[PDB]
Amino acid sequence: KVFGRCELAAAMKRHGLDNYRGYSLGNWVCAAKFESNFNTQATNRNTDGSTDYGILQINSRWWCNDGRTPGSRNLCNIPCSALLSSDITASVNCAKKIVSDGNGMNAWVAWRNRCKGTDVQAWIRGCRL
Template sequence: MKAFTILFFALALAAPAFGDVLNRCSLAREMSRLGVPRDQLARWACIAEHESSYRTYVVGPTNYNGSNDYGIFQINDYYWCQPADGRFSYNQCDISCDDLLTNDIEPSVRCAQKVLRMQGFSAWSTWHYCDGRLDSIDDCF
């Protein structure tokens, strides 16, 4: 029982290192602060909801090609970030995948914006949930 208690407290203290769980409004406000156009915020919130449930620390299951997806927007390590294990990556965002798993979402936002510029919102497999009328984010501000 003592070992369990120690393990429980060790994990509880380490939990903040694993990242945050945001919500629609906290994500929209932070992205707005980072300069993301307001007319995109509802779409980004929808993508984050469906990709990671607004969790910044998620590493998705291994994809068919051996790659993984990281962070709140589930950014793929084969194309966009460098995985810690040294596997090949095009690393188009010039970033470590671990930098996409922190409470600071700026690296994830910047990389996601690059994905958007290069491939559009359809780069996300959950896009079909977000392609259409979305709830307004106006109540977040």
């Protein structure tokens, strides 16, 4: 599923990401934009052999199981393929764990490099949220 901008904002909010660990909705929408371009089915291989999955490009080394990442943990206790569903529940549950891990949203390098410090509220402009 390729989400619309306000559509993903509404789902993220309904799932409780707005102000989660102090990160405003615009931060989460921004991260999704540059991680996946709002495409739930986005997958991207990492140099280390792991793969990122879904709207927030969650990695198979620590967070989800994809059967092909040696020495992997599955701390969200989900198959990585579940992070590609049209329903973002599994991605959101897992993202809550990731962001609570100690480094906040810096865990998303694209967030750090492209969203952090910027006018993130622009990502939710025009939305009936």
